[PDB]
Symmetry: C2
Subunit: 201 residues, 2 copies
Amino acid sequence: PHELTENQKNRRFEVSSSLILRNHNEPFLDRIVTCDEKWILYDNPKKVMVTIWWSAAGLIHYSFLNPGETITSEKYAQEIDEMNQKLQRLQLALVRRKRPILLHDNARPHVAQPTLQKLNELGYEVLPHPPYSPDLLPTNYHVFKHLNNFLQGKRFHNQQDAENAFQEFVESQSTDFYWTGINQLISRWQKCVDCNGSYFD
Amino acid sequence: VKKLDKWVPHELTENQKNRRFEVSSSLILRNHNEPFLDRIVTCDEKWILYDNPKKVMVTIWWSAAGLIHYSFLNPGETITSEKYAQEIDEMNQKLQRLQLKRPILLHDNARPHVAQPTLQKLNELGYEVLPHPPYSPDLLPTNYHVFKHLNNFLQGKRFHNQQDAENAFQEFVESQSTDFYWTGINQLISRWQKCVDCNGSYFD
Ligand SMILES: [Ca+2]
C-alpha cells in the first residue's frame, strides 16, 4: 500500500519470477480465467457492485449484486458455479481443451472455505498471487482501467442506467480486448522482477 | 507448539487452514493437469548436536532422484541470505552434473535467510518455486520424511566431537537408496489430498 514493506516486495518478486519461468516452460496464459469486483457509482443505495469473469478468449460472465450489497463467500461460490456453466458452453466447440486456472486476488471473501471448496470441486487450480498487487491483476490494470475512462463524467439515476452503461462498455470493446490484457502479464511480471518487487507504475 | 521439529500454532487460525487448503488443492490439480513431481528439488536445515557451541547446522538438498548436496556451517556461525545464495549455486552445479528438466524448488520461504539475495539467485538460475502455506512442515518432505527417519537413526546416540556428529549425518543420508528419496516426494499427493480432506487442518 502506502509503501510496500521489504517482505511484501520479496513476495511480489518471488511470485512474478516463478510465473514467468512457469509460463516459459509450460505456457498457461490461454487457460487463465480471471475476475474482480467493482462498485459502479450512479453519479461519477446509490452504488451497485459488478463482478466480471473473463479469459483471453473473451468475456465469460458478469452480474450485478443488489444495490449497496457486497459479495459474500457463499455468493462468490454461487457466481463461480454460474461462470463455470457459461465457460463449459463456450469451450463446446474447441478441438482441444485443458482445465482453467483462476487468477484472482486475496480479498477475504475470495479466500474463504465455501469458495475454496467450490474451486476444488470444479477442478480449478488457483494461480499464486502476492498481496497488494493490483498491478498484476488484469481486471484491475486493464478492464477496470478502461472502464473508469469510459465512466468518467457520466451520471445515472437508476441501477438500470448504470448496468446499461456497463453493457455498453462491454459491447464497445474490440474482440481482442481481453486477449491483449492477458498478454500483458508477462511484461508486468518481468517489470516486477526488474524492480526487485517494487511497484513499477 | 512443536511439530516435526518446527514451531507451529497450538491451533491453526481459520485463515491458516484456508491457506493450506488452497495451496494443497491447487497443487493436486496442477500435478493432474501437468505432472511435475519428478522436477521437484527440496531442502531444509537442521541443528546437529554434539558434545552430548555444541551444535552445527547442516543444509540438505535432494530430489526424487536422490541426494543432491549437503553442507555444514561452522559452529557459532549463523546462516544468512547471502550464504544460502552461495549454497544454491553449489547445489545447482551438482544438480546440473547429475542431470547428465527445469527444476522446481519446494522450500519454506518464511525462513529469514530467504531474502532478496536468495530470491535473486533463484531467478538468475531459472528455478521456479512452488507455493507453500505457512506452518506446514507436514507438507515439506525434508521434514515429514528425511528428518523423521534421521531422527529415529540418531535416537539414543551421543557425540562428543563435531566430527563424530557430522559423520553420523553423512552415514545416514548417504546410505539411503535413491528410492528412499523418491518415496518422500511421491508421498506429496496423498498429503495434499489429506489436507484438503481435513479442510486445511493438520492430519497427523
Ligand atoms: Ca480487487
